[PDB]
Amino acid sequence: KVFGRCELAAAMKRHGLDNYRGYSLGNWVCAAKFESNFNTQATNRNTDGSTDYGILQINSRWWCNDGRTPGSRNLCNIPCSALLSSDITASVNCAKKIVSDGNGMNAWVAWRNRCKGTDVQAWIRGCRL
Numbered sequence: 001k002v003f004g005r006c007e008l009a010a011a012m013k014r015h016g017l018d019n020y021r022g023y024s025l026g027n028w029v030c031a032a033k034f035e036s037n038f039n040t041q042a043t044n045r046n047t048d049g050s051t052d053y054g055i056l057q058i059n060s061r062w063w064c065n066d067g068r069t070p071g072s073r074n075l076c077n078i079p080c081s082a083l084l085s086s087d088i089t090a091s092v093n094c095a096k097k098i099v100s101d102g103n104g105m106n107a108w109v110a111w112r113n114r115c116k117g118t119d120v121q122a123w124i125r126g127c128r129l
C-alpha cells in the first residue's frame with residue numbers, strides 16, 4: 001500500500017507517535033516519506049547481510065527476524081514480514097522501541113539526511129492534527 005501523507009499522519013497519531021520520546025508527529029511522517037515513499041512494502045538490502053523493511057525501513061540486524069541476517073537480536077520479537085503489512089501497527093510499535101535507544105531517530109538514515117532539524121510541521125500541513 002502507498003499511504004497518503006495525511007492518511008499516514010492520522011494513523012501514526014492514533015498509535016501514539018506525536019511527541020514520542022521528544023519527536024513531534026511531523027518527524028515520523030517525514031521519515032516515512034523519505035525512507036519508503038510511504039510504501040508499506042519497501043525493502044532495502046544492505047551490505048552487512050541485513051535488510052530494511054516496510055514504511056519505516058526497520059533493519060533486520062537488531063529488530064526483526066528474517067532468518068538470513070548475521071548478528072541477529074530480533075528485539076521487537078517479530079518476523080520481518082510483519083513490517084511489510086498494509087496497516088502500520090507493527091511498524092509503529094517496533095519504532096517505539098527503536099527510538100527508545102540512545103540513538104533516538106538517528107536510527108533512520110532518511111530522517112538523518114532529509115528531516116533532522118527541518119520544518120517538520122510542514123509534513124502535517126492541512127491534516128488538521
Ligand SMILES: [Cl-]
Pocket residue numbers: 004005006007008
Ligand atoms: Cl492524504
Ligand SMILES: [Cl-]
Pocket residue numbers: 011014087088089
Ligand atoms: Cl491504524
Ligand SMILES: [Cl-]
Pocket residue numbers: 024025026027120121124
Ligand atoms: Cl510536527
Ligand SMILES: [Cl-]
Pocket residue numbers: 065066067079080081082
Ligand atoms: Cl520474515
Ligand SMILES: [Cl-]
Pocket residue numbers: 059062107
Ligand atoms: Cl538499527
Ligand code: NA
Pocket residue numbers: 052056057058059107108109
Ligand atoms: Na533502517
